[PDB]
Amino acid sequence: XYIQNCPLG
Amino acid sequence: XYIQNCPLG
C-alpha cells in the first residue's frame, strides 16, 4: 503493498 | 494488497 506501507519495494 | 491477502476487495 500500500502507499507508504509496501515492505517489498 | 497481495495474492489472497487483500481485505479491500
Side-chain angles (χ1 to χ4, degrees), chain A residues 1-2 5-8, chain B residues 1-2 5-8:
Chain A
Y2 304 98
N5 181 43
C6 181
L8 293 175
Chain B
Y2 310 87
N5 169 26
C6 182
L8 301 174

